[PDB]
Design a protein around this ligand. Structure first.
Ligand SMILES: CCOc1ccc(-c2nnc([C@H]3C[C@H](NC(=O)c4ccc5cnccc5n4)C3)n2-c2ccccc2F)nc1
Ligand SMILES: [Zn+2]
Length: 203
């Protein structure tokens, strides 16, 4: 593995930006915290820059080729990613071959602009079985990990499917409607930050 993790100081403006974006993008969900638990804040334990030359080259190469297909704009966004595979993604990069064959928008890799949305997928689809220790989707004890990723959306197809529709590079969903984003190529996302956190008990 060529992956290096740069621990960021909490007083670092880079840490604070990722910290603020995580806290500020929390929303009240329609499922009442069934999937991701009950909280309005996080305990931010650690934020690490993910450095991997091979993975960066894979991303920038795809970003250029999506750019030339989409009027010389990549449509690059910073989005959150939750999945039980974070530990794999930071070493191997995103891999569409492991996508959930049955999903709202087919076998793609899902991102959110709301940290609390990505939180719902950390322990599986709809929080799966919860934390491995307590089997609790609302565990305040167990440490969770999100990625904050550079994602190339390109020309995004709006939907309310194996690959992007023709002429398109991604899908934007809006099923309290919140925006999800799907790609069908792992090279269209770079996992830039690894965020280790807990959900905070309110009171
Ligand atoms: C609204 C429908 O609900 C959702 C929400 C999120 C996702 C999703 N998005 N991304 C994923 C993960 C699969 C994909 N896997 C990898 O990138 C990856 C990368 C390297 C891997 C190495 N070894 C084993 C597995 C590996 N997996 C990220 N998943 C995902 C896939 C399977 C199970 C849970 C998931 F969150 N799928 C459906
Ligand atoms: Zn737990």
């Amino acid at each position: 593995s060529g992956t290096i993790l740069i621990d960021l100081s909490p007083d670092d403006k880079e840490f604070q930006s990722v910290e603020e974006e995580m806290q500020s993008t929390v929303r009240e969900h329609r499922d009442g915290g069934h999937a991701g638990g009950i909280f309005n804040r996080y305990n931010i334990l650690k934020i690490q820059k993910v450095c991997n030359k091979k993975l960066w080259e894979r991303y920038t190469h795809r970003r250029k080729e999506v750019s030339e297909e989409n009027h010389n704009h990549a449509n690059e966004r910073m989005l959150f990613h939750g999945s039980p595979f974070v530990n794999a993604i930071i070493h191997k990069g995103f891999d569409e071959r492991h996508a959930y064959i049955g999903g709202m928008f087919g076998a793609g890799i899902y991102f959110a602009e709301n940290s609390s949305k990505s939180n719902q997928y950390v322990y599986g689809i709809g929080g799966g079985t919860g934390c491995p220790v307590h089997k609790d989707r609302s565990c305040y004890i167990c440490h969770r990990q999100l990625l904050f990723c550079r994602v190339t959306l390109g020309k995004s197809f709006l939907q309310f499917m194996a690959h992007s529709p023709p002429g398109h590079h991604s899908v934007t969903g809006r099923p309290l409607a919140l925006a999800e984003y799907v790609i069908y190529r792992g090279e269209q996302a770079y996992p830039e930050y690894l965020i280790t956190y807990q959900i905070m008990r309110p009171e």
